Design a protein around this nucleic acid. Structure first.
Lengths: 139, 253, 45, 232, 51
RNA sequence: GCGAUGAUCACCCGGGUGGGUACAAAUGGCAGUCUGACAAGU
RNA sequence: GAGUCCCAUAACCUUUGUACCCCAGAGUGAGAAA
RNA sequence: UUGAGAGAUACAAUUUGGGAAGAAAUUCCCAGAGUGUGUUUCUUUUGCGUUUAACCUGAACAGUCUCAUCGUGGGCAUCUUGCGAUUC
């Protein structure tokens, strides 16, 4: 029982760290952005830069697309690597949480065997071992 | 490819070959080695594990030419049976022996006779670390007959699972062709290194030169690591010699 | 009022390059953009 | 220091730097309505507090990340928020509109409402109209014109709700922004087909669609449709 | 927020330090928390206080 | 127009950073809210 | 079944705001100014 | 080797719009399409044969007694050398 308590307390800590981290992170949108035009000719002559009034490089930035009007001391690479490091740290938290979830699950499966009841082990062709209890109501 | 162009390599090889006929003491010398002076210490502890250098242009030997011994895991019944019956590998080996049988049957002077009889020694990669004690000192100094690791079957291992024991005759034949046709080297923690490049009376001087550039190219190319690209920092000099002849320079920096 | 000279239309179009160029440093590099997508999909999933 | 910078839609800012987050200037400095992290930076210098806008919590914020061409919510405008569950998104809408603008937040469920009322005390520009949206005639007094109508109601008959609200309170050439959940309307068919029907329904209600935007990865099977209300 | 908490937490609401120290070090956990000052618990004695 | 009633003894560009001492606040961090079906009598 | 009893009504760290500091400490002990 | 449709990707030819540099032609950068071929994913049409298939469920482990857990001894280093998991 104390083992299950200990393993869980670590897992809950890991989850809480992750959700705090993900709030820091920003996630690029990947979704279709359909435009509606009343005329067929407007559809054919449509161009993203003209509709958004932005330079062509600037069109592709979804989060902050700025009209040409608005457009009118740390090294960049080290900044870029540091952004990458933060993403990796949150990802590492997820892996730790998932690993802890599996460990906590199997320990509970062991605890059920300890408790009173009548059980039979069933082994699948793949070799996985599980226990099916008899349909006896608990007094 | 500069070393081939330089006439110094050609002129040295002609002198080396010419001497071998004239001098009685070099009559039994048949192989040509190149001695490489790497600029800095390699840093690789000698593990007695050969590393193969692919010689693309030409082929040093063929499996049929050499007396080949195979040392297999105990029991050797499976490996011996499959190799002997299959047409491709039926005649590929001088003899097939297990490690325990090799230890029991051959001791003392019998090891020396075993060294003379066989020109090439190959072994299952699993038993290789045992061989130094069994074969004795004579095999494991000088590098003439160091056992070569070979993998019997293409099956790979996974942690917490058991290897399935199989024997693939074509794969065993396939690896052995690569060993004999290509040259090989063994790392050591110093400047010096020795690699075989040709055989007297079998390879012409231009053929030997081509092998030398292939050896140098593979050893210097960092893209070929860990097997190649081990000579970092350039080569101060290169020599050519037989087993007992003196080192004749062929390239200096 | 849309009275731009070509020189007027040029000096501004230099500013467009100037400011857009500045935001490229923040926008981050494409090679890291490639790997950072792989990380995200794992954590989002 | 973090370099807070402008964004296309006025009242929205991006705290560019080591962490890049959408932020909005805080109407009520010194507190977070739902525990969001707060960033303050000095400008000529006086410090001004900004609140983080989390896209996974507000569908509108997911709209910004997708890069909506046009937002009818802007500083100095009146906004009608339908389906205001709490201050998770209404507070951010209250920020962009600014002290001049006002936000009409409409909600039905009692329990989230008491949360909304408590938040409305901190924000003077939020008029909380906890009422059922299906009957706009009830709360007509407390609402004047509205420049834009934002709807997050997750109902099958939402299109009717927007038509009824739009006809009464929305300005001519006024704004309507809708957040759509495919699963609530029709789980049998794919999300795209459901979105097609909703666009057609709005057209019959004298609303021209301008933009459609799926909100992935922030939400699955969700999209925002933006249109302009032409009464003529 | 208290209503949305299960019975176990309400038992040990006021003894997080002892509880959350105990969990991490694999030792026994407290059993009274803030409720120890309740009148009914005072009437009990021995191990019955925990029950 | 002196004194034992006590002489003497960090940084950068007028401006900005660095470090130290006392108090106050934080819906800032450490930080994660125990187990779960038997027990008592004749 | 199970540590209230090492004040989670708390301690520590970080950020902000305010008010002061950038000299020695059992401080030194006859100079200062011209 | 049936028909049709939608999508992705590789290649070849060819084209749309924004920007800079050039007197223009022209040069470069960015964003993008449709055409032919090859590959691939899915949707369905038609011809032929076939009427069942999968899973669950009743008092369905256990005399050669079965199983769990904590310990002990030995084997596999020519390797299941063994994860709070199940090596024999």
């Amino acid at each position: 029982t104390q083992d299950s308590n200990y393993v869980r307390t670590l897992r809950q800590i890991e989850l809480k760290k992750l959700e705090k981290g993900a709030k820091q992170l920003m996630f690029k949108s990947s979704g279709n952005h359909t435009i509606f035009v009343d005329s067929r000719e407007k559809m054919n002559e449509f161009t993203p830069e003209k509709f958004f009034n932005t330079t062509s490089e600037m069109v592709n930035r979804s989060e902050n697309r700025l009209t040409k009007d608005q457009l009118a001391i740390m090294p960049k690479e080290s900044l870029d690597k540091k952004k990458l490091k933060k993403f990796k740290q949150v990802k590492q938290h997820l892996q730790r949480e998932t690993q802890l979830k599996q460990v906590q699950q199997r320990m509970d499966a062991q605890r059920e065997l300890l408790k009173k009841g009548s059980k039979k082990k069933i082994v699948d062709s793949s070799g996985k071992i599980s226990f099916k209890w008899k349909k006896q109501r608990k007094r | 490819n500069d070393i081939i162009k330089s006439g110094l390599a050609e002129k040295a090889l002609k002198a080396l070959i010419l001497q071998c006929e004239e001098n009685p003491s070099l009559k039994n010398d048949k192989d040509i080695h190149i001695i490489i002076n790497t600029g800095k210490k390699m840093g690789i502890n000698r593990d007695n594990i050969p590393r193969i250098i692919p010689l693309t242009k030409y082929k040093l030997f063929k499996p049929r030419d050499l007396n080949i011994l195979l040392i297999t895991k105990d029991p050797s019944a499976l490996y011996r049976e499959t190799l002997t019956k299959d047409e491709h590998t039926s005649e590929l080996f001088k003899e097939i022996i297990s490690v325990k049988n090799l230890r029991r049957r051959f001791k003392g002077s019998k090891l020396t006779q075993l060294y003379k009889d066989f020109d090439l020694v190959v072994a299952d990669y699993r038993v290789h670390h045992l061989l130094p004690e069994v074969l004795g000192s004579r095999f494991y100094h000088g590098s003439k007959k160091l056992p070569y690791m070979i993998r019997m079957s293409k099956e790979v291992k996974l942690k917490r699972q058991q290897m399935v024991e199989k024997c693939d005759p074509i794969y065993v034949r396939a690896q052995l062709r690569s060993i004999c046709k290509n040259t090989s080297y063994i790392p050591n923690n110093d400047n010096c290194l020795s690699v075989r490049v040709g055989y007297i009376q079998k390879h012409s001087i231009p053929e030997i030169l081509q092998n030398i550039q292939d050896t140098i190219n593979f050893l210097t190319d960092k893209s070929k690591r860990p097997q190649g690209g081990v000579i970092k920092g350039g080569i101060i000099s290169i020599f050519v010699k037989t087993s007992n002849s003196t080192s004749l320079p062929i390239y200096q920096f | 009022e849309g009275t731009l000279t070509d020189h007027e239309r040029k000096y501004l179009n230099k500013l467009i390059k100037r400011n857009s160029q500045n935001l490229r440093s923040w926008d981050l590099e494409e090679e890291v953009r490639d790997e950072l997508e792989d990380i995200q999909q794992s954590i989002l999933k | 220091k973090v370099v807070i910078e402008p964004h296309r839609h006025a009242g929205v800012y991006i705290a560019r730097g080591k962490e890049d987050l959408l932020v909005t200037k805080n109407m009520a400095p010194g507190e977070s309505v739902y525990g969001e992290k707060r960033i303050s930076v000095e400008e000529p210098p006086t410090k001004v507090e900004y609140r983080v806008w989390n896209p996974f919590r507000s569908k509108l914020a997911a709209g910004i990340m997708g890069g909506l061409d046009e937002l009818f919510i802007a500083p100095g405008k009146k906004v009608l928020y339908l389906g205001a569950a709490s201050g998770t998104s209404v507070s951010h809408v209250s920020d962009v509109v600014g002290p001049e603008g006002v936000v009409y937040a409409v909600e039905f469920s009692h329990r989230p409402g008491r949360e909304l009322i408590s938040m409305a005390k901190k924000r003077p520009n939020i008029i909380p109209i906890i009422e059922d949206a299906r009957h706009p005639q009830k709360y007509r007094m407390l609402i004047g014109m509205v420049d834009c109508v934002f709807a997050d109601v997750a109902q099958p008959d939402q299109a009717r709700i927007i038509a009824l609200n739009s006809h009464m309170f929305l300005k001519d050439q006024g704004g309507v922004v809708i957040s759509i959940k495919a699963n609530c309307i029709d789980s049998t068919v794919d999300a795209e087909t459901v979105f097609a029907r909703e666009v057609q329904k709005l057209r019959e209600e004298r609303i021209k669609p301008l933009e459609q935007l799926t909100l992935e990865p922030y939400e699955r099977d969700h999209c925002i449709v933006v249109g302009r209300y032409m009464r003529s | 927020s208290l209503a949305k908490s299960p019975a176990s937490t309400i038992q040990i609401l006021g003894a997080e330090k002892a509880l959350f120290r105990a969990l991490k070090t694999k030792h026994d956990t407290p059993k009274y928390g803030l409720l120890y000052h309740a009148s009914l618990v005072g009437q009990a004695t021995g191990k019955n206080k925990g029950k």
